[PDB]
Curated annotation (Swiss-Prot), chains C, D:
Residues 4-44 form the LDL-receptor class A domain. Glycans are attached at residue 44. It comes from Homo sapiens. Homooligomer. Binds to the extracellular matrix protein Reelin/RELN. Interacts with LRP8. Interacts with LDLRAP1. Interacts with SNX17. Interacts with DAB1. Interacts with PCSK9. Interacts with PAFAH1B3 and PAFAH1B2, the catalytic complex of (PAF-AH (I)) heterotetrameric enzyme; these interactions may modulate the Reelin pathway. Interacts with STX5; this interaction mediates VLDLR translocation from the endoplasmic reticulum to the plasma membrane. Interacts with CLU. (Microbial infection) Interacts with protein VP1 of the minor-group human rhinoviruses (HRVs) through the second and third LDL-receptor class A domains. Glycosylated. It is found in: Cell membrane; Membrane, Clathrin-coated pit. Abundant in heart and skeletal muscle; also ovary and kidney; not in liver. Residues 10-32 are annotated as: (Microbial infection) Interaction with Semliki virus spike glycoprotein E1. Changing residue 25 to A: Complete loss of interaction with Semliki virus spike glycoprotein E1. The chain holds residues 110 to 151 of 873 of the full protein. The gene is VLDLR. Disulfide bonds join 6-20, 13-33, 27-42. It is linked to Cerebellar ataxia, impaired intellectual development, and dysequilibrium syndrome 1: An autosomal recessive, congenital, non-progressive cerebellar ataxia associated with disturbed equilibrium, delayed ambulation, intellectual disability, cerebellar hypoplasia and mild cerebral gyral simplification. Additional features include short stature, strabismus, pes planus and, rarely, seizures. This is Very low-density lipoprotein receptor. Multifunctional cell surface receptor that binds VLDL and transports it into cells by endocytosis and therefore plays an important role in energy metabolism. Also binds to a wide range of other molecules including Reelin/RELN or apolipoprotein E/APOE-containing ligands as well as clusterin/CLU. In the off-state of the pathway, forms homooligomers or heterooligomers with LRP8. Upon binding to ligands, homooligomers are rearranged to higher order receptor clusters that transmit the extracellular RELN signal to intracellular signaling processes by binding to DAB1.
Length: 49, 98, 44, 44
């Protein structure tokens, strides 16, 4: 059963999604962002000392 | 035969798919516990079972398969009658092997 | 003691229950009785 | 005797009480039943 949602990028926020399939009882998921990391791409230019 | 009085029909869920994608619940009032032959009086919806167990609790369930967006059929239980109408949503599976 | 020994082809559905079910429901594989005595001592 | 032996995956919540609790509620740390039989003889 395909589903889609949008959840905030806040660490520790307890996002809960409600999936309501027509033939079955509704379901509630829980997703949470424990940790995030933003990695740039680097090109070394020179070294100084 | 058990005496059935004030038989009402409600449909829990419906989905017009090839398999039996309907749940039908009947409420009734009886004096004794017995066996009734259940039939549907239209070809818009097809029941799955022929006989049901009627008890003093006053609730039996049936499974039916339909292909129309909104069916409407007359279901009988021993000698009683009712009119069942429901709203059905299309199924998501494109192809089935049965 | 005996309270509702009711009819011709019932099983009285337990010695202390207020139920009469047809004899055809004895050892059918389903617990029709509240106590479940209908499925007790089956398989002779 | 036995009162209301309930269903496939119930616990019947005491032989003298009319309650059904799912098997998932056995030894959960909560006294769902009035008699508390579900939390008795836990920790096998
Ligand atoms: Ca039985
Ligand atoms: Ca419990």
């Amino acid at each position: 059963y395909e589903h889609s949602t949008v959840m905030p990028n806040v660490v520790g926020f307890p996002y809960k999604a409600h999936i309501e399939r027509p033939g079955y009882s509704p379901l509630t998921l829980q997703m949470q962002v424990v940790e995030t990391s933003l990695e740039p791409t680097l090109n070394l230019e020179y070294i100084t000392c | 035969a058990p005496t059935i009085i004030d038989l009402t029909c409600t449909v829990a869920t419906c989905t017009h798919s090839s398999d039996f994608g309907g749940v039908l619940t009947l409420t009734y009032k009886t004096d004794k516990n017995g066996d009734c032959s259940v039939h549907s009086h239209s070809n818009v919806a097809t029941l799955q079972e022929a006989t049901a167990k009627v008890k003093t609790a006053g609730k039996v369930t049936l499974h039916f398969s339909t292909a129309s967006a909104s069916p409407s059929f007359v279901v009988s239980l021993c000698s009683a009658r009712a009119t069942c109408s429901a709203s059905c949503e299309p199924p998501k599976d494109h192809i089935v092997p049965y | 003691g005996s309270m509702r020994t009711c009819r011709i082809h019932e099983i009285s559905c337990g010695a202390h229950s207020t139920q009469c079910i047809p004899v055809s429901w004895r050892c059918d594989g389903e617990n029709d009785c509240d106590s479940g005595e209908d499925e007790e001592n089956c398989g002779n």
